[PDB]
Amino acid sequence: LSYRHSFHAGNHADVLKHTVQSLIIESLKEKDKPFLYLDTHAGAGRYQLGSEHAERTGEYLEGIARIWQQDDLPAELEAYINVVKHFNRSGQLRYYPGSPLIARLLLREQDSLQLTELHPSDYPLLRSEFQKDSRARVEKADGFQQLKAKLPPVSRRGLILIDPPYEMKTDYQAVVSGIAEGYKRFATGIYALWYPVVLRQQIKRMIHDLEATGIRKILQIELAVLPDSDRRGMTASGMIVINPPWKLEQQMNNVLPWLHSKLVPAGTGHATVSWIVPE
Structure with missing residues (x-):
């Protein structure tokens, strides 16, 4: 199969996420x-x-x-x-x-990957990327269900990266419920959730629901290319990190001004690092 084309890949959101x-x-x-x-x-x-x-x-x-x-x-x-x-x-x-x-190029020999994708173009392509890389397990299965099935890891260490669909109200709710289920099983995991800002109110509700889980140590990193609006697509995106590593806050405070200056030469929008839940 030929590699998948994408109009959005490598955009400002991917730059932040990665x-x-x-x-x-x-x-x-x-x-x-x-x-x-x-x-x-x-x-x-x-x-x-x-x-x-x-x-x-x-x-x-x-x-x-x-x-x-x-x-x-x-x-x-x-x-x-x-x-x-x-x-x-x-x-x-x-x-x-x-x-x-x-992840494939940054992980070490001893580390593991567990990957899930349901789409019938993307899954076979993903399998092909990891042929003979025995560190990876690639399955055609529901992503949120893996937070119940695969946690905690036998290594007892890990990064859980959640970059989910945001197409309807239930999509935003599925995110918080899934994180809660994973955290229940693996409370010392590092959870990194990517989110878009199309309507700020949906994000406000999502973060409110996340606070309600009682989960502590939640960092929020956001970069906006434009001010919030009702009448644009995505004006901004962010990463919510549960149990961030010791240096992450400092590292992001160091690089966000440069990143925002390069990604947004007109200087519109904003770039922030702050805590949703401290501790």
Whole structure:
């Protein structure tokens, strides 16, 4: 099968999501003991950029394109950008890695991957990406159900990355319920949830519901390319991290101003790091 095309891959949201994922993975690697990378909605593995037609078009033009060849790239972005460069060795943007391939190139020999994807184009492509990589288990199954089935890991260490559908009200609720079930089984796991800002009120409710679980130690990192609106698509996105590694808050405070300056040259929107639930 041919690699999956995507119009959104490598956009400002992916830049934020993958900056955070890489920093968490690098922290987990500071202990020589094994850990698990669990991706509930793993997608195809990699995406072709630029569209199937002759013109080079896609949101990557306002995302990864604006940072990957900067000479003053912050040190916190090196691990991530080096993965992107690996899939684009000619020096032209043609492919963008999904979270599973970020994980594949950053994890060590002793670490494990557990990946789920239901889509009939994406799943077979994902399986092909991990042929003969025995560290990975790739299944065509419901993502949220893995938080019950696969936690806690035998290693008792891990990053759980949740990058779910947000198409209806029940989608936003499924996120909080799933996290609660995982946390019940694996309270010391690091949970990283990506969310879009299309309607702020849905996000407010989601965060309210998350606070209500009683879960502590919840960090929020958000980057907005525009001010909230009712009449745009996605104006912003963020990462909510439960049990963030010791350095993450500091690392993000260090890189967000640079990231926002490069991703949003007009200076609109905002970039924030704060705690939803302290402690």
